[PDB]
Design a binder for this molecule. Structure first.
Ligand SMILES: C[C@@]12CCC[C@@](C)(C(=O)OP(=O)(O)OC[C@H]3O[C@@H](n4cnc5c(N)ncnc54)[C@H](O)[C@@H]3O)[C@H]1C[C@@H](O)[C@@]13C[C@@H](CC[C@@H]21)[C@](C)(O)C3
Ligand SMILES: C[C@@]12CCC[C@@](C)(C(=O)OP(=O)(O)OC[C@H]3O[C@@H](n4cnc5c(N)ncnc54)[C@H](O)[C@@H]3O)[C@H]1C[C@@H](O)[C@@]13C[C@@H](CC[C@@H]21)[C@](C)(O)C3
Ligand SMILES: [Cl-]
Ligand SMILES: [Cl-]
Ligand SMILES: [Cl-]
Lengths: 488, 512
């Protein structure tokens, strides 16, 4: 009987009878209050037929209710998919038909237009109960009234913690729902508690999106595991965030640089105490208004990106924080993971040789929802295949080179990377389009470590790279411009 | 979906991630992680060629050695388990242990215990079917561990081992000894929690000066060191200058040391120049008189280093500590990750706040059971809870208090009393150093509560003043009839309380 998420809540209610667990605007909950609510919720779920292996889709922004649902589903051996709130109806429809939830918890604010249309496209296939979460607390088709109708008795079920409990859709087109078990999350949060020096006094601002692994690992689940206080913001607004930092005495946040600079300018000279916040990302941009984190997470450079990982490995499973100075850009595996770089023929690559990053261990997810064939192939031979490219340095460390999905017939990323190991190059795209540093300047011929055949026969130069509306690299934009066709 | 991490995986990852880091030192033996994994693979090879596979059993009958780690890992790569037996076992219990555990293989030691060994084999007679390999042998002894190992090939066994299966067995002593079956998962979880408590990493150098037959040395800090790829330095026995020199030579950050050795180290190192400043002092920091660096980890800061905790072998060690959850009214603190706890009454209903009952547990640190104890395991695991046979209570602030044992009980017309409850509340009195409670026959159905009280040398207190002290925290029907005073409680040669002796001295009897 291994520890489940349910056990974690049942222990914190007895061990921390008066400490704040969740805060969400006006709502505040101690661990007892939360466990009672999770028990009510789990009562009404078991009432509506939800049990082992059943499925729930959250369709909204960040909410304290996400944590509650996860716990309740966990206590029944069910799973919650925290879906993408910005999905247009085609994608939203796809996920619904894919994940096939028995119940859909949804948000009116912001997306009701899209939600409404999508249900109409589903028509008579929409055999799921929908509860509005941001409803008036009386609403009969409402979350709060769904929960209140349940009783306080913990269902006390013997749940296999290897059963999935959190499903994250991972984003070459098609989206797939990664199955993260109770064990995946607890193994992740214990690792993370060591990286961050996280404890019961940790107050963490959930300003990162819960539809994605980032916010969960740093630091949602570890804060939760160690009994810290998780504070929820629906949206990131610099003023409100800055305000919560003071009010909840927050020690950690999930903040991106543009937000931070917004808080800095805005807080300057007003004298509010932001010194309790341990800043992880880009410490200098705070100027000193907050305290520079000295946990291994920041010290090592993992906070700035020194690491490798993915949703399917419960997030950031390899960092410069495990094992010390590393020549490679990602560091080494933390505990609960073993990695090997494998070539085409499934054999271990030699030191320096590039291949696919493959993993086994406790942090490796359970597979994708409803992807039998992709799972069989990705789990071949008792290794999870990440589809990412890497190599081992002689010092032991690992280097993340890029993806293996983008391919050229006899890998681009491998050379994209080699090219970006020129001081004059800022970034490169190989199909070899090149964006140079503003100050440097170098010959196409100097550009042209790798093998006789792998080098391209041409190098264009751009002011920057094309990019999608999300801001990620846009390749099919410049497959056109520079002659890109014939792809295997 | 694939298996969880094993002990074999840990080694496999370290040999790739830390090719030149030192893993094990033992006298002149030094081993980087690749050198250790190749050794383990050879040993695993010869173990498999001898017929050792899943479920099979190896007994170590010796003091601390680097080879012990080698066996654990090698047995773990085959799905086998290693029992680290008590080297100071006398022949009768060496036999019992060998009969009970029934290993296919015995790795034994000649220095200091050979005679005992010789006597025990004689006693086993023609049920002594195991292969015996001498660890500290002449290096070309064919019945010696080194040559047995060198017969193995370098290939990894590369089996799909279930990490829930036992890999380490520690005997825990009524006087009945039982082998606690600890899985790969038990030790990795323990190790992972310990890494957070003591801030352990790859730079850790832990001197293995505690005994490896006991969970202590493993939790602090053998296994977390191993897990985070740090250096493990072994010592066979605990002699202070040896220890002193090895702290200096190997630059250890950590060592397992009780206060008697600390005090002798501090004398011998008195004006020598020797640098012990690397050592982070966890036990009795003041005793070093500045010579080592007081530990700032959560382990020391919380009092957990000084015994503010609760646990046992069956929970993979110290699983409840003041380091988990901050300041605590109870003496034990709170459960770590990997563990939930409840205080259950005699009917199995959960006691109320402040009410004394059996400490019971669930979670990842809980052991797989005792080896070869079907009826007891079935009883001790009743209801999906591990019953610890320890008595405690939850406090108003959610912290836990370890009161003592439930193995002793007094007869009562109301409901059987736990002497450990009364003992504890008497031991609260600030003038009392220790208290022991026995039962005096009072008809067939009950015994009188009799207290034997050891005072602090400079304190006064009457029988009545002690009795009065308990009134508010224990029920009327539990309070003692009489109090006797002693200079010290009698003990065994093991230094455990001798309740048999007290019974005798003050007319105790008529227990359940
Ligand atoms: C979110 C984190 C942690 C989990 C992995 C990851 C990568 C992520 O976005 O997960 P994913 O989208 O589900 O899938 C991952 C896919 O991204 C590629 N990748 C792998 N390691 C990478 C790295 N080192 N850089 C950039 N890309 C990387 C690879 O091809 C893989 O398949 C990171 C991005 C990372 O910049 C941060 C965001 C933020 C919080 C933690 C990480 C932080 C502190 O600023 C760092
Ligand atoms: C060894 C450690 C860690 C593992 C648990 C334990 C207790 C132990 O010795 O395990 P065991 O041989 O299986 O005995 C278990 C039986 O001990 C009783 N017990 C429970 N919590 C206790 C506590 N708080 N005090 C005294 N006794 C306690 C109870 O009845 C239980 O069943 C400790 C004793 C502890 O004094 C230390 C030794 C040393 C290293 C770590 C711990 C250190 C830093 O000084 C602390
Ligand atoms: Cl396969
Ligand atoms: Cl001898
Ligand atoms: Cl009373």
């Amino acid at each position: 009987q291994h520890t489940t998420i349910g056990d974690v809540l049942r222990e914190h209610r007895r061990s921390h009878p008066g400490r704040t667990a969740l805060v969400d605007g006006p709502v505040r909950l101690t661990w007892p209050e939360l466990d009672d609510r999770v028990n009510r919720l789990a009562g009404s779920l078991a009432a509506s037929g939800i049990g082992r292996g059943d499925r729930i889709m959250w369709l909204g922004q960040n909410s304290f209710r996400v944590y509650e649902l996860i716990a309740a589903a966990g206590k029944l051996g069910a799973m919650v998919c925290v879906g993408y709130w910005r999905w247009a109806p085609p994608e939203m429809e796809f996920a619904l038909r894919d994940f096939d939830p028995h119940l859909v918890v949804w948000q009116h604010q912001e997306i009701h237009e899209t939600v409404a249309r999508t249900r109409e496209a589903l028509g008579s296939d929409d055999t799921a109960r929908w509860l509005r979460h941001d409803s008036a607390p009386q609403d009969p088709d409402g979350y709060e009234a769904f929960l209140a109708a349940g009783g306080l008795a913990d269902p006390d079920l013997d749940i296999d913690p290897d059963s999935p409990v959190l499903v994250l859709y991972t984003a070459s087109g098609r989206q797939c729902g990664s199955l993260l078990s109770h064990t995946n999350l607890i193994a992740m949060a214990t690792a993370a508690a060591w990286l961050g020096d996280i404890d019961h006094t940790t107050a963490f601002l959930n300003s990162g999106p819960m539809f994605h692994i980032g916010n969960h690992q740093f630091w949602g689940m570890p804060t939760l595991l160690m009994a810290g206080k998780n504070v929820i913001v629906r949206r990131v607004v610099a003023e409100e965030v800055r305000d919560l930092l003071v009010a909840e005495e927050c020690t950690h946040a999930f903040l991106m640089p543009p937000t931070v600079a917004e808080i800095v300018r805005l807080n300057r000279d007003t004298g509010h105490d932001l010194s309790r916040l341990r800043a992880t990302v880009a410490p200098h941009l705070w100027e000193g208004m907050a305290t520079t984190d000295t946990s291994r997470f920041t010290r090592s450079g993992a906070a700035a990106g020194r690491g490798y990982g993915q949703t399917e490995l419960s997030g950031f499973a390899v960092t410069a924080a495990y094992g010390g100075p590393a020549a490679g850009n990602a560091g080494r595996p933390g505990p609960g993971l073993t990695v090997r770089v494998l070539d085409t023929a499934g054999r271990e690559c030699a030191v320096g040789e590039a291949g696919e990053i493959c993993a086994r261990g406790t942090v490796v997810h359970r597979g994708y929802w409803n992807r039998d064939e992709v799972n069989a192939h990705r789990f071949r031979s008792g290794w999870w295949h990440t589809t990412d490219l890497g190599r081992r340095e002689p010092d032991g460390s690992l280097t993340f080179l890029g993806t293996t999905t983008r391919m050229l017939k006899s890998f681009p990323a491998e050379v994209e990377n080699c090219i970006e190991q020129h001081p004059a190059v800022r970034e490169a795209a190989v199909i070899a389009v090149v964006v140079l540093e503003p100050d440097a300047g170098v010959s196409e011929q100097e550009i042209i470590r790798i093998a006789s055949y792998k080098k391209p026969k041409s190098v264009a130069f751009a002011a920057a790279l094309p990019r999608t509306v999300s801001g990620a690299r846009d390749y099919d934009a410049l497959d056109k411009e520079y002659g890109g066709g014939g792809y295997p």
